[PDB]
């Protein structure tokens, strides 16, 4: 068998669509994440300020005033290889241990 | 205010799956510009152009990497080679002729050797060397080269400066994040001198005990030191006129890169209209993006 | 697999393998073009879907 | 009471509605909404009833 090398990392459907596996392990809306998959919604993957959240829905006009604020002070980006630091970044046994 | 009505659409939408749509709606935004703004726009692309040919310009070495391959190839009783086209090739406001490569070259070794002496006089920064140095660049203004050799010549710089920033970047490396270099005083006291070592033991005049101990790393954090120094020699060029040549190169760039990116979004609308006509051999949108 | 009267015929996977091939290495010479963020979303779109 | 629920008030909201309908995700503007409800019924070249 062989491969082939992506330029930018690509979300599996399998556990995308099908029911969600992703969602679940996000703990996020399904709509919010095709919304975020098609280039149209911005994600924090952190918040270095106390505005921004974890996971927020972001617009393209309201993503504008964060950056006029704080700029580098926040991470939040576009794409799938967004889902996938955010993926990343979260840890479940902190999450075993609170919830 | 294209964008606001785009707050209502997207916010409302039916959670569309066909890209096409996605497509359009999003260069939608854009309007029709004519009779100004291709005349503007090519402007602020032309004056990035000649912004990046006096980046080109200051560089001294440049203008003999110009000349060293030509004398590769003009002692071979013939220049048979492609690169005989990345001549100067001047402007006038063709097959390269001897009346017009060579005569175009007497004045280049002049400028060589007249801009050396009068550069010693009166320290690098006279009045009448400074001038000369940049006539030497007026004569190298007036060619109009190809972008397969020049596509290199940018890189002569880039390197160049990601070198010496790295070589900036390592001093931080190995004594600022253990030490504890507090920042307020390194800027000022490395660009006082920056060639041999009154801050460093200015450093060790004051209390500073976190740097009085610095024999252990002293034979590591000089050598940042000798390589800027080399860096320096080489070049032949001193590090305040290259932090200069690499400020007001990048905001050349990024104005070219700005004023395309401005303009090309601005036609997109006749690449979707003339792929439809293709359209079906290969895909609907694999049309648009190779008409992109 | 050639058919015997000259022809060939295959399975649709090969289909789909040339498919995201062609965009993925368009995607690559989009970013030594230094393509706008707005074109570039769409062939990320792209091959998300194919 | 059918009314009791439109929430239309005149012929440009409505066709806003209808446009949004038919093509989800596309702006609507002034003129795309007529010109597709009147090919949806009324165009001789897309409707027919023999």
């Known amino acids: 068998m062989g491969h082939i090398e992506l330029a930018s990392p690509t979300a599996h459907i399998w556990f995308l669509k099908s029911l969600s596996r992703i969602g679940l392990l996000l703990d996020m809306p399904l709509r919010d994440i095709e919304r975020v998959l098609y280039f149209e919604?911005?994600?924090?993957?952190?918040?270095?300020m106390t505005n921004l959240e974890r996971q927020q829905i972001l617009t393209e006009e309201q993503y504008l005033d964060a950056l006029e604020e704080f700029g580098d002070e926040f991470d939040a980006k576009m794409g799938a290889e967004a889902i996938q630091a955010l993926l990343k970044s979260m840890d479940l046994e902190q999450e075993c241990e609170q919830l | 205010a294209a964008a606001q009505v785009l707050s209502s659409v997207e916010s409302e939408i039916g959670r569309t799956t066909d890209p096409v749509r996605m497509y359009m709606r999003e260069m939608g935004t854009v309007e029709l510009l004519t009779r100004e703004?291709?005349?503007?726009?090519?402007?602020?692309?032309?004056?990035?152009?000649?912004?990046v040919q006096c980046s080109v310009a200051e560089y001294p070495e440049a203008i003999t990497y110009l000349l060293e391959q030509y004398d590769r190839v003009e002692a071979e009783e013939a220049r048979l080679s492609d690169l005989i086209t990345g001549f100067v090739d001047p402007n006038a406001e063709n097959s390269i002729d001897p009346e017009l490569a060579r005569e175009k070259f007497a004045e280049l070794r002049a400028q060589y050797v007249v801009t050396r002496d009068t550069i010693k006089a009166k320290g690098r920064s006279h009045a009448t060397a400074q001038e000369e140095i940049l006539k030497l660049s007026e004569?190298?203004?007036?060619?109009?080269?190809?972008?397969?050799?020049?596509?290199?010549?940018?890189?002569?710089?880039?390197?160049?400066?990601?070198?010496?920033?790295?070589?900036?970047?390592?001093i931080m490396k190995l004594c600022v994040e253990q030490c504890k270099m507090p920042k307020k005083n390194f800027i000022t006291l490395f660009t006082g001198n920056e060639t041999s070592d009154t801050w460093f033991n200015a450093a060790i005049a004051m209390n500073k005990p976190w740097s009085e101990k610095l024999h252990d790393v002293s034979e590591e954090v000089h050598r940042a030191l000798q390589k800027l120094?080399?860096?320096?020699?080489?070049?032949?060029l001193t590090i305040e006129q290259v932090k200069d040549i690499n400020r007001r190169m990048?905001?050349?760039?990024?104005?070219?890169?700005?004023?395309?990116?401005?303009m090309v979004e601005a036609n997109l609308r006749?690449?979707?209209?003339?792929?439809?006509?293709?359209?079906?051999?290969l895909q609907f949108l694999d049309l648009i993006q190779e008409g992109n | 697999v050639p058919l015997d009267g000259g022809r060939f015929a295959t399975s649709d996977l090969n289909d789909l393998y040339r498919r995201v091939i062609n965009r993925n290495n368009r995607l690559?010479?989009?970013?030594?073009?230094?393509?706008?963020?707005?074109?570039?979303?769409?062939?990320?779109?792209?091959?998300?879907?194919? | 009471e059918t009314?009791?629920?439109?929430?239309?008030?005149?012929?440009?909201?409505?066709?806003?509605?209808?446009?949004?309908?038919?093509?989800?995700?596309?702006?609507?503007?002034?003129?795309?909404?007529?010109?597709?409800?009147?090919?949806?019924f009324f165009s001789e070249d897309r409707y027919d009833l023999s």
């Not at chain 2, 990048?250 to 401005?262: D, F, N, T, V």
């Not at chain 3, 963020?37 to 998300?48: A, S, Y």
């Not at chain 4, 409505?14 to 949806?40: C, D, K």
């Open chain 1, 41 to 48: 919604s911005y994600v924090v993957i952190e918040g270095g």
């Open chain 2, 37 to 51: 703004g291709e005349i503007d726009i090519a402007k602020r692309i032309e004056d990035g152009i000649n912004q």
């Open chain 2, 139 to 170: 004569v190298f203004k007036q060619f109009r080269l190809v972008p397969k050799q020049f596509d290199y010549l940018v890189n002569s710089m880039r390197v160049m400066m990601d070198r010496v920033r790295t070589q900036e970047r390592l």
């Open chain 2, 229 to 236: 120094q080399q860096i320096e020699e080489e070049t032949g």
């Open chain 2, 250 to 262: 990048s905001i050349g760039e990024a104005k070219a890169r700005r004023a395309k990116k401005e």
């Open chain 2, 270 to 281: 006749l690449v979707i209209s003339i792929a439809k006509k293709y359209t079906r051999g």
């Open chain 3, 28 to 50: 690559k010479r989009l970013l030594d073009l230094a393509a706008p963020d707005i074109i570039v979303r769409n062939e990320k779109r792209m091959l998300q879907e194919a």
């Open chain 4, 3 to 40: 009314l009791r629920v439109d929430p239309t008030n005149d012929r440009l909201s409505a066709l806003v509605e209808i446009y949004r309908m038919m093509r989800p995700g596309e702006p609507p503007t002034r003129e795309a909404a007529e010109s597709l409800f009147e090919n949806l």
